[PDB]
Symmetry: C2
Subunit: 104 residues, 2 copies
């Protein structure tokens, strides 16, 4: 990376957006989210990811639920209404920057 | 803002990218960059912006030049070769995220 600071800042924003994107389509376990973000080209650790998850929930954008399924307790995450609205707004911001910088 | 944390993180990235975008086109003063980023919808002060400018120069992505013009000393910034390469990479990353996140 010629600009590691940019990549770092930008990756934090992109991860956040992908989490909402995925949690709007699906209920998600964190284990799975790590794999899926990795598929999308993002390096993420449990160390990085769960605190974001917790913070999104604290911001009211996600909600988590302890759920016993098939004799095993797990936490699932999903978007709240506010989270869907946030996703739209966050996307809008990305669209604007895309329009500006990809065309004095 | 439904997602202030996102906006905050994202604005840091967007400001950085705009600085390079503008400094690749032409030479720029920081006073002017404040106005121009403000035109583009980014809330920035000299207090916020100049440190970014200094940091980009320290990262080798910009270079500045003291110039005395019309009886007054001013600093102009421009992209270095490494900054143009960075610009391309940073744009690429933005295009990819755009394509992905726009079901």
């Amino acid at each position: 990376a010629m600009d590691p600071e940019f990549m770092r800042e930008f990756q934090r924003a992109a991860v956040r957006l992908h989490i909402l994107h995925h949690a709007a389509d699906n209920e998600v376990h964190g284990a799975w989210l790590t794999q899926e973000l990795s598929r999308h080209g993002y390096r993420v650790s449990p160390g990085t990811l769960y605190p974001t998850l917790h913070r999104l929930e604290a911001d009211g954008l996600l909600v988590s639920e302890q759920r016993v399924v098939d004799g095993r307790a797990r936490r699932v995450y999903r978007a709240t209404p506010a989270g869907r609205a946030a996703l739209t707004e966050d996307r809008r911001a990305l669209e604007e920057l895309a329009r500006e910088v990809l065309g004095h």
